[PDB]
Amino acid sequence: EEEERAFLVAREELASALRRDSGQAFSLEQLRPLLASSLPLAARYLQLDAARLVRCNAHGEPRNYLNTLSTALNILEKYGRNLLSPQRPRYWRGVKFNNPVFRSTVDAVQGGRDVLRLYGYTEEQPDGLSFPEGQEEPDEHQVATVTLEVLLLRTELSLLLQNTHPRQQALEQL
Amino acid sequence: DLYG
């Protein structure tokens, strides 16, 4: 409970840092307290369904599926950061399933789309996902916290690929 | 681009 609190505090500091500067890059040294924790995934990923993201896409050699996952995660990170930009992109309100970059990266994994819903892309058109007309701007806290979790998971997978994750054997539990 |  105490370790869990320290984690949440660390999570909030990083999410706030993303709200001030959406282009802010985090070093592995910065992410260390979020990486070194022995807390379960459910207590560390509050918005992202990390276990389902990993487990439902673990098909074949890790060296391939972890790489595919990273690729989806890196693009999902860019979607989040763009929503935090002091100047939001024109057409931030919707993402098309048939976007070349979206199809080849995010739609390559199971649950890729659900992550856009966490950002606020809750409305479903057969062409893609949109914000509701009633939402005029993105909830910045929700967005920052999802973006951070997306970046954290990508960071975790990257160390697994390199075999340098602090809890590497305990994470191959799956 | 991500929104096309």
Residues in chain B, total = 4
Residue with tokens 């479903």: A124
CB neighbour list of residue A25: distance below 8 Å, 6 or more residues apart: none
Classify residue A60 by burial, with Cβ atoms within 10 Å: 0-12, 13-18, 19+: exposed
Query: Alpha-carbon dihedral of residues A10, A160, A103, A132, nearest 10 degrees?
Result: -20
Is B3–A100 a contact, with Cβ atoms under 8 angstroms apart? Answer: no
Q: What is the DSSP letter of A88?
A: P
Q: Domain A1-174, what architecture?
A: Up-down Bundle (1.20)
Question: CA of B1 to nearest chain A CA: how many angstroms apart?
Answer: 7
Residues A38, A7 contacting (CB under 8 angstroms): no
Looking at chain B from residue 1 to 4, which residues have their Cβ under 8 Å from any Cβ of chain A? 1-4
Residue A59 CB: number of other CB atoms within 10 A? 9
> Residue A125: which H helix or E strand, with range?
strand A123-125
The domain limits of chain A are 1-174
Distance CA A99, CA A111 (A): 17
Is B4–A78 a contact, with Cβ atoms under 8 angstroms apart? Answer: no
Helix, strand, coil percentages (3-state) for chain A, rounded to 5, are: 60, 5, 35
Instruction: State which amino acid sits at residue B1.
Output: D
Interface A-B, measured as beta-carbon pairs within 8 A, has a size of: 22
Distance CA A68, CA A111 (A): 13
